[PDB]
């Protein structure tokens, strides 16, 4: 199916506690495969998935030099950002970067992304055209003017249509037994009385990959959106994800409720009921 590669950088200043820490993590779909941390004893790009371990010494060396240069650039950006917002040198601030490419089943580029956030708020983003920027405020307009003057978007587009697509295609081939495998959810419904007249029905989905899933409860075939407690999809720690959806039902009406599960790992969607 469709695949993505994304890099996620976090630079956090810490006045009085040294220079800003730079951390980067790289993903293919929901699978993390690399990390880089400026606070590590000997900062270097490290493998975090089995299929990337085969990359030679030149891979780890080149990438380590890229992150080290980026950490320095982010520290310069944090200083500039503090000035654009007339902020004191005393407070901590965060600069996040998120970029990458989406490709279809045939490896062709579907969409590129290259964007940033300052203190958790969108700051600037490369538009879908990969040629122009959208600035959130008058401070990001300064970054936009600088990047327009430097024709910065052209280098971003070249990576997104080039290296990004070519390396993602390589990683998908090298990690095909996992990256091209969808593990379906293992499901069950639990029943817990709350009182003499109500019980919770909880619909479980376990051991699935990728994370994308749809879990819903219906009462007489009608979606129970407002009355369902739906937890965020969570990692199990073994590459898979979990999720549950619960509803409070009147005692004796359990058979009117159906849990519906949609996941790419499933031949067809599941319809589950409480089986006493």
């Amino acid at each position: 199916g469709s695949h993505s590669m994304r890099y996620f950088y976090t630079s956090v200043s810490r006045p009085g506690r040294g220079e800003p820490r730079f951390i980067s993590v790289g993903y293919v779909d929901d699978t993390q495969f690399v990390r880089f941390d400026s606070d590590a004893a000997s900062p270097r790009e490290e493998p975090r998935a089995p299929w990337i371990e085969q990359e030679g010494p030149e891979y780890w060396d080149r990438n380590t030099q890229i992150y080290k240069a980026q950490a320095q650039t982010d520290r310069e950006s944090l200083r500039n950002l503090r000035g654009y917002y007339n902020q004191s040198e005393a407070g901590s601030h965060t600069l996040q970067s998120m970029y990458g490419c989406d490709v279809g089943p045939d490896g062709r580029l579907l969409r590129g992304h290259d964007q940033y956030a300052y203190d958790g708020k969108d700051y600037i983003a490369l538009n879908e055209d990969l040629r122009s920027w959208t600035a959130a405020d008058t401070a990001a307009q300064i970054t936009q003017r600088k990047w327009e003057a430097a024709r910065e978007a052209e280098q971003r587009r070249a990576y997104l249509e080039g290296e990004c697509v070519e390396w993602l295609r390589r990683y998908l081939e090298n990690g095909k037994d996992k990256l091209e495998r969808a593990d379906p959810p293992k499901t069950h419904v639990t029943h817990h009385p709350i009182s003499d007249h109500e019980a919770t029905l909880r619909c479980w989905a376990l051991g699935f990959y990728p994370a994308e899933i749809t879990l819903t409860w219906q009462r007489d075939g009608e979606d129970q959106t407002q009355d369902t407690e739906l937890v965020e999809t969570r990692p199990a720690g073994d590459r898979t994800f979990q999720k549950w959806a619960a509803v409070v039902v009147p005692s004796g009406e359990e058979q009117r409720y159906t849990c519906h599960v949609q996941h790419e790992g499933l031949p067809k969607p599941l319809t589950l009921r409480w089986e006493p």
């Binding site: 980067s24 500039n80 990047w147 910065e152 280098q155």
Partner: peptide
């Protein structure tokens, strides 16, 4: 593999 920017900063 990660991207290299122009390096002129924000």
């Amino acid at each position: 593999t990660p991207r290299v920017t122009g390096g002129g900063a924000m």
